[PDB]
Structures are given as C-alpha cells and as structure tokens.
C-alpha cells in the first residue's frame, strides 16, 4: 500500500504542477517549484512504501522525470537519487527486470523495463558526470550496498546497470575511501558473481518475444570490466574463477558463429538473402569478441585469434 487510485491522483497533481511551471517559464514569468516538489512526497514516511517509489511503477510517472529535473536544484535531485537507491529492491521495475522474481516477463513488462532504463539511467548519468563530488557518489554506493541485497540487484538489468554507472564514475573521480567502499561491494558479491548471467530458459523466453536469435549481454561484460578495473589482483582472481565457464561459453558461441561464416562464404551462388545472413553472422561474431574483450583488456588479456593471451 498504496493504494492504486491515490498514486494515480498524485501523478495527475505532478503533471498539473509541471505544466504550470512550463507555462510560466515559456511566458518568461517567475517560477516557484515548491508545490511540485511537495507533490512528489520525497520527505514522506507515512506509508509502508514511499509514494514517489510507487509513482515510478507507472509509465506516466517515469515519462515526466526529465521535466521534473528541469525545475529542481542539486540537493533536491540528490534526495531523489538517494530515495531510489535506498528502496531499489522495493521498486517494481527491479522486480520485473529480475530473472529471479520475473522468470517469464510479458512483452508489455519488457517495454516498461526499457522505458525506465533509457529515461532514469540517462538522468542519473547526466547528474553524476556533471556534476557530483566524491562524498556524494560514495554516499549513493553505501546507500545501495546497506539498504539492499546486492546479489538480488545484479539479477536485474536495471540493478546491474545502475551499479556499473556508480563504479565507473568512482573509478574516474580519483586521479582510498573508494577502496574500502569497493571491497564492501565485492564482499556482497563474492561467491555469487555468476548469478549476473541469466539462465538459458530466461534468454530463450526474451528471444521469442523479440524474435531474435542472439542475446545482448554487453551490459554483463561492461559490469565485469568495471568491477575488474577498480579491483586489485586478488579481486580479479575471484572474478576470473567465478566467471570462467561464462568466458568459455562466450568463446564457444563465437567459434560456432566463425564456422557458420566460413561454411556459408565458400558457397559459389549467393543471393541478397545469403548476403544478409552472412552480415548478421559476422556482426554477432564480432559483437561477442568486442563484449568479452571489454572485460579481458582491463586485466591486460585478449581473445585473439582463436585463444586468450596477454595483451601486447
């Protein structure tokens, strides 16, 4: 709770407040975002689940987020990011994007996940890059690690992608407290790193719904590239040991595509449809090499031409 009607009436209020601010601004009139900020209920603990968190369950709530950020200051935006991180596991979008809680998502559920990802992660990237200081990024990570089961978040594409954004920004911000925060994150992941890879039945289900024969796992390798990057030799050792089977599953998949390419390219007669198939195979074969190499290169390793070796 809730309830459903109350949250929908709250979104309508947010829409009304934003439209008044937008109208005032356009006409070059003085804007006051107090009524709008109060309509959000960020500083509200009167319910089991925070009303703003509940607003994010609805696509209409998600779509107005960039417009809300146009009328907020630095601290207000940070309060929003902190409420999101603090209650990540109680966000229905995380429950929908997790292969554990939602093993069979509907196409509608997948569209909601994708809408949320391109809107909410764009907002977070824009705020953290320009501009947020060390203490604030460290604070968001600690909020995420202390108020959530981190391994459950890594089973969700949004959860994993939110963690990658935070690690990658922290890695850029220092040219020693991060070293302690990173190890707290590593602690919560150790012996569960393989669980970031969804089971085959989940991937087969996502593929049927989108009519595709290849799963995009670039985000999984980007998370791993980031984690290995900020880790010491002992962390990299654990990562390699835990994801070893996934590295060899990706290589087998790429080598299967490499052989399909060679067998079809030798065919004397070639139509535009065989041309399309070969380009599709070449594209997917090269994508697997690139995704795995984003991770391996970080540890000075490279997959070429048929094996893994030290990067020159």
């Amino acid at each position: 709770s809730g309830g459903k009607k109350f949250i929908l009436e709250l979104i309508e209020t947010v829409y009304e407040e934003i439209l008044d601010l937008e109208a005032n601004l356009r006409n070059g009139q003085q804007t006051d975002s107090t009524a709008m900020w109060e309509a959000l209920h960020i500083d509200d603990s009167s319910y089991d689940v925070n009303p703003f968190i509940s607003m994010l369950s609805f696509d209409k709530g998600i779509k107005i987020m960039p417009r809300i950020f146009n009328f907020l200051d630095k601290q207000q935006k940070l309060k929003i990011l902190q409420k999101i991180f603090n209650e990540l596991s109680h966000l229905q979008i995380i429950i929908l994007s997790s292969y554990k809680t939602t093993p069979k998502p509907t196409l509608t559920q997948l569209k909601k996940v994708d809408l949320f990802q391109m809107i909410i992660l764009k907002i977070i990237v824009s705020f953290l890059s320009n501009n947020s200081n060390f203490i604030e990024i460290m604070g968001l990570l600690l909020q995420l690690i202390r108020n959530n089961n981190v391994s459950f978040l890594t089973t969700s594409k949004i959860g994993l992608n939110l963690i990658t954004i935070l690690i990658s920004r922290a890695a850029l911000i220092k040219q020693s407290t991060w070293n302690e925060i990173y190890d707290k994150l590593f602690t919560s992941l150790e012996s569960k790193i393989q669980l970031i890879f969804p089971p085959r039945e989940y991937n087969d289900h996502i593929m049927r719904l989108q009519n595709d024969k290849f799963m995009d796992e670039a985000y999984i390798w980007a998370f791993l590239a980031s984690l290995a990057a900020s880790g010491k030799l002992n962390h990299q050792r654990i990562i390699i040991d835990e994801v070893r089977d996934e590295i060899f599953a990706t290589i087998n998949e790429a080598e299967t595509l490499q052989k399909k390419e060679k067998e079809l390219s030798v065919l004397p007669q070639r139509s535009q449809e065989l041309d399309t198939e070969l380009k599709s195979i070449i594209y997917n074969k090269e994508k697997l090499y690139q995704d795995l190499n984003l991770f391996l290169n970080v540890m000075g390793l490279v997959y070429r031409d048929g094996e893994i070796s030290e990067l020159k």
Binding site: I240, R244, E310
Partner: peptide
Amino acid sequence: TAHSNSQALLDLLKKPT
C-alpha cells in the same frame, strides 16, 4: 608487475575447473 599479474590470471583462467 602488470605482466606477472596478467600471466597469473591467464594461468588461472586456463585451468579446466
């Protein structure tokens, strides 16, 4: 070194299990 670390990681990765 970065070389010795990379070699340790390669050797670990190349183990069957």
